[PDB]
Amino acid sequence: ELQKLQWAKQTTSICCYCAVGCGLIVHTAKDGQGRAVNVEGDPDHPINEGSLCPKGASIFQLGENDQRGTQPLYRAPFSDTWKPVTWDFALTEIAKRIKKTRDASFTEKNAAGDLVNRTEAIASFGSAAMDNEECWAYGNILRSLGLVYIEHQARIXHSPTVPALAESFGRGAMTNHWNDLANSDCILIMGSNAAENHPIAFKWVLRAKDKGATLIHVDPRFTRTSARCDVYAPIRSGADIPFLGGLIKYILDNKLYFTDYVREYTNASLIVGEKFSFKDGLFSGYDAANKKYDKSMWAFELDANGVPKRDPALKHPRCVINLLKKHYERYNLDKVAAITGTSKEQLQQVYKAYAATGKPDKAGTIMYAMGWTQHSVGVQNIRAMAMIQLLLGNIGVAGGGVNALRGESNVQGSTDQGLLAHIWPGYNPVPNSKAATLELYNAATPQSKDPMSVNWWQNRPKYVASYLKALYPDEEPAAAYDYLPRIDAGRKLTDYFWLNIFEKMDKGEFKGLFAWGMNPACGGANANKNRKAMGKLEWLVNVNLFENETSSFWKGPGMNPAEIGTEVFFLPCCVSIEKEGSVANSGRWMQWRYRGPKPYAETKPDGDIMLDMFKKVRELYAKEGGAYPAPIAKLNIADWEEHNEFSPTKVAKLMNGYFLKDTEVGGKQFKKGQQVPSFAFLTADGSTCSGNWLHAGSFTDAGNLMARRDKTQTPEQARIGLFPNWSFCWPVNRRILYNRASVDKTGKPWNPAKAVIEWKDGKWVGDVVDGGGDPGTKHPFIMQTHGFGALYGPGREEGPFPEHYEPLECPVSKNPFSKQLHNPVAKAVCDPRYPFIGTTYRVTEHWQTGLMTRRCAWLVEAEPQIFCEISKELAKLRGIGNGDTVKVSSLRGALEAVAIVTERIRPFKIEGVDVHMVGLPWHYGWMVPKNGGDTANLLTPSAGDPNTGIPETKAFMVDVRKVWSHP
Amino acid sequence: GKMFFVDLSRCTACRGCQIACKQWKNLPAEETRNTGSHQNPPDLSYVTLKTVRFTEKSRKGPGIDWLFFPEQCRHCVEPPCKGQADVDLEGAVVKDETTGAVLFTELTAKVDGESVRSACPYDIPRIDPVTKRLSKCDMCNDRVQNGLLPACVKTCPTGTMNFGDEQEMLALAEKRLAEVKKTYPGAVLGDPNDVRVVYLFTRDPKDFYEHAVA
Ligand SMILES: Nc1nc2c(c(=O)[nH]1)N[C@H]1C(S)=C(S)[C@@H](COP(=O)(O)OP(=O)(O)OC[C@H]3O[C@@H](n4cnc5c(=O)[nH]c(N)nc54)[C@H](O)[C@@H]3O)O[C@H]1N2
């Protein structure tokens, strides 16, 4: 008998770090009544099969950790001390701050007389670390209070993916899932360090290799990922579009594309109108004065009924495919090799290996994560990967897909719940000031007159109405529509995003900030500015596991507490293994997890913190009145709680949705109170509520499908690893998106040995079919307006085809592909004192700002201090020896780090000059551990893309100098 | 008995095994600092039974040969650490007759610890400065006898770590060696007839660690 686990209760959980979604087993002493005694991998979980990387493997040390917060702390204005206070005091005073700030700032109408009903004096950051039910409740609490400045992590690493993949396929999500990587014949890892940043993914990546796959890593650095790939191809920072453009040209020149798939399922046959053109690096319709495109110059030619014309023969000169060929003919090997720094030999090797997957019996996948997709044209980077995958027939198939790796455990879910300024839950847009009615809101949805085009978004009025019924069930949806805030139609969308929030804070334009489950004092670019800007807040609420650089910014480096008037409330939340709820992993698996030990000390789950906070705000409004109380007073929070506690189960059932009356829908009768079985049965007339239509199907009358732990599989399911009875994924358990593209028009798989779906005896067998309908009767991309995978993507701000524009401003002066050097729809100083390209990235052992992992002694043990990785060539130039202390400096700040001199970094040759890169982990911060160092974001600029609102963390100019000590 | 097969050609140096070993036994962390390497702790110690060693080797063309070596007691079939300890006190080092695990006991404080360490061809034993007890990997013998995999085997994401009966593990090591040789012509098994932790090295084992093999 193992004494350690004797007398302890075993429960299951899901790792609280990255988006792989590994399963845990937690043992809790005293048969559940004591503390955790052991945490390790769940041997039965189909993704990790008991494996854990060091972050998952140390969760015991995260939870049973005497450095955790134990109770609320209060920091009075100009004080230098925390005072421990009760939850009642902290939440009552916060509710008072919220109400006073809202009452003083609330705007019913904007300066144009349009209804907006919002407060602009509070902002909120966070968080992908909360459970899905907590994320959904949190956004609705914020919007009921009138907030529009609602952001979190997803803005940086997730937001570029969504329009890029939605333009191409109709949805922004990762198209396949982790287990499916083992079905791939060629895995291209580009803009991802997956062996360190999604480690259990290499279980499946190496299993593909075991079956004969070629693994290719394309990265400026040699990493732990590169060590285990067949091909490591170095690429110069920011040269990804040339690399991918060369691959497009290669595919097209060599007729390696899958003609039948391309002809039927992409928009290759659509006829582009005569107004489209491309010249000198500019698409037609360019407005030079405003550096913006009139996208109507890119329109398709339409037939009598408004459907884009098609030439299925693919011979018309204005067919997408023929315009595609013309566009990429400039991306020849020698130019691509010159700019990428990849040898022509390696380019040919990579191109041949990957384009071989255009055969229907071979599948290729692309894995990318954050990489350098945040600059001006990162969306076009992703667009090019999507176009390559469509040309090769790799979308919809097992071992194919665009596997855009999500970062954090629940960043998929927190985005699904609308914790970004521009979206409500379920990717319904936040209304702007000119959507004055629900009918105007609904009128913006594009329609299609192609009877083969499903155009599923035409159902949006059902989802909007059902969401409004979930918040305000006793109101008509058109009435409830007026309760929620609207953004200004005149303003640029990025005015409401991450980077402008820090900007407005530095200008004193926010009275209050919620730092909910985030550490902006380390995670925001240009940390010196942000740390100072936090001092301009009246009040700051930090909800977090530990005291940290954000909660305690007022006593950070160079800070005088006596000069800083900000009132701070630190509210300690409980860790993942101390609460129940769900998290949605990168493959959209919505996985239920259970409480092991009870919350440590006096910590609380986020859901209880926010609900008690909101209830106190409600009480103040019922006693005092104030600005527009109705959205607060009428919010349906009864459905969120049970046993006087926040209820994950009840919130999850409301997010799924249920019938508010007896209703007839889709040819069946439903009783009041029944769970909605799928989003197909939602309605627009108020018969249904649903907090998030994507969740309709996750928690039905059959029970909690997210909590299924059933490994049952048919032979065809098990052959590719669908595990359809393990948990639940949106939408309606379709595990591989776009799987109708995986079959021909009789319903037979292109690749029978790896079938995803198959038409058998009048039904689709295998995965859940992505879009109902007989074989050959529907276009396969049902969320697209026109139904096709988009090679030509005319909704993108930079043009309908990706085009190289230099993202490296300082060391490059020439664009070999056009006279247009930088992005034409997009002020680096390039001070010559800072001649090296700094970059930040991750290591396996630490998590994000390191707030969590710098508190875990076993992880500090392996990676104790900030380090700086440099080439042997740069170390020689600067006289730096390995292990020396160096000072890294920028126009923004300076820090010291330990030099790591390694051939894993090599100089870039740019225009005949060696250009040196300097690598830093952003995992460190002044609070802990001793001598760990501070955040690499002291160096980064707060300048970001005009069009994405993301700061530059992958290429910023620095100097590196040896720090000397005594002889 | 039991045996590990450790296929270093699959290792991503994630260090899950390093952390899992300490979680299962609730071992303390050492004081470390970065001296120009991701490797840490720099060495095995009384509180560190496994550490992943990092070695970079130049190669023609881009990249490097990055060699990762999760070091642990080899659980020798005929352990000389036991032979040396038995000179001072039998029972300080014992061998589990079912698993083959070589086990240090509290009686190691009563033997010449330095000579026990010097007897080991792999330089594995480590001494506590306070108590003079010896420590090392114990094969997670507790877990094994109760039907669980060793913590570092269970946690491994890549299939580097393998554990089982010696005959299946030896057959696996031989078949994996033949396959791995097609990419790494210099691949070899470390002392496979003498130890219970059989590493597959992709080249000269001493490039992974000076004591990688006897
Ligand atoms: N261990 C660990 N894992 C994590 C995290 C963590 O903190 N620690 N964070 C999680 C989160 S929130 C996120 S968003 C993801 C991020 O996942 P990743 O994108 O994998 O994270 P990075 O290490 O920052 O960048 C990955 C690779 O991009 C390369 N790169 C830099 N510039 C370029 C370029 O121009 N082109 C190309 N092709 N490559 C380039 C870098 O050298 C690096 O190897 O990881 C998640 N996983």
Ligand SMILES: Nc1nc2c(c(=O)[nH]1)N[C@H]1C(S)=C(S)[C@@H](COP(=O)(O)OP(=O)(O)OC[C@H]3O[C@@H](n4cnc5c(=O)[nH]c(N)nc54)[C@H](O)[C@@H]3O)O[C@H]1N2
């Ligand atoms: N230079 C540079 N900067 C970057 C990046 C980069 O690559 N380079 N990456 C960017 C990206 S992609 C991201 S994801 C951000 C990350 O930015 P942050 O989110 O601010 O980083 P952390 O605070 O370290 O994320 C871990 C947080 O999760 C919290 N947490 C864990 N569990 C819970 C819970 O149950 N409830 C609550 N309320 N909180 C919980 C911990 O307290 C901790 O604050 O950093 C961004 N900034």
Ligand code: SF4
């Ligand atoms: S951090 Fe990611 S790969 Fe590591 S154990 Fe957690 S979910 Fe799995």
Ligand code: SF4
């Ligand atoms: S857990 Fe496995 S892959 Fe990770 S370092 Fe240990 S042996 Fe290598």
Ligand code: SF4
């Ligand atoms: S077998 Fe057990 S004691 Fe030995 S290294 Fe692995 S986890 Fe540590």
Ligand code: SF4
């Ligand atoms: S490796 Fe050394 S310590 Fe381990 S059993 Fe062999 S002789 Fe003893």
Ligand SMILES: [S]
């Ligand atoms: S994230």
Ligand SMILES: [W+6]
């Ligand atoms: W992220």
